Amino acid sequence: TPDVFISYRRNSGSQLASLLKVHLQLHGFSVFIDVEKLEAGKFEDKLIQSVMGARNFVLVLSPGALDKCMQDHDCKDWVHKEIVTALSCGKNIVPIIDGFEWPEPQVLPEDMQAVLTFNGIKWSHEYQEATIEKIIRFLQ
Numbered sequence: 081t082p083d084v085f086i087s088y089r090r091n092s093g094s095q096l097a098s099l100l101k102v103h104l105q106l107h108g109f110s111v112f113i114d115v116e117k118l119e120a121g122k123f124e125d126k127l128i129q130s131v132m133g134a135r136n137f138v139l140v141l142s143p144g145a146l147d148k149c150m151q152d153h154d155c156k157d158w159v160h161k162e163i164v165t166a167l168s169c170g171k172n173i174v175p176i177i178d179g180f181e182w183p184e185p186q187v188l189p190e191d192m193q194a195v196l197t198f199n200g201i202k203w204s205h206e207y208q209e210a211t212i213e214k215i216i217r218f219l220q
């Protein structure tokens with residue numbers, strides 16, 4: 081079962097999410113990203129189970145990636161759902177910052193405000209190898 085779950089906003093972070101997957105697999109990690117490992121069945125159950133199964137939760141914070149979480153108090157947004165699962169389960173959450181603006185916590189639903197308290201890694205286009213090396217040091 082995967083060591084690492086990658087959560088991302090499809091319309092803005094898909095390329096970086098894919099790049100992270102490639103690098104982490106090259107360094108020996110088993111990685112869940114939906115387009116490679118989400119298979120048949122009711123995707124709500126399968127996605128939550130896949131977050132639960134992975135020790136590490138890598139969150140791709142592209143610009144505006146949490147915008148659709150705002151006021152989503154019924155937890156219908158999928159990045160919101162994945163984050164709440166990771167927080168509840170006490171996962172090793174590793175945010176990756178790629179143009180993300182740090183919001184005031186009160187714009188987010190209470191059940192995910194804690195995601196902002198985890199130390200995030202800045203994605204450097206100029207120093208990608210060093211960024212990847214730092215991500216690997218953060219993983220368990």
Ligand SMILES: Nc1ncnc2c1ncn2[C@@H]1O[C@H](COP(=O)(O)OP(=O)(O)OC[C@H]2O[C@@H]([n+]3ccc4c(I)cccc4c3)[C@H](O)[C@@H]2O)[C@@H](O)[C@H]1O
Binds near residue numbers: 088
């Ligand atoms: N039965 C169906 N089969 C195939 N495609 C269906 C569908 N029903 C609806 N769509 C299509 O999917 C789109 C909504 O997905 P997107 O808007 O792009 O997602 P987001 O960027 O918000 O979230 C991305 C984050 O949530 C996770 N994720 C993974 C899989 C998901 C699936 I599968 C459906 C919906 C959300 C998902 C979210 C993923 O692991 C990542 O971390 C709609 O427009 C439909 O065209």
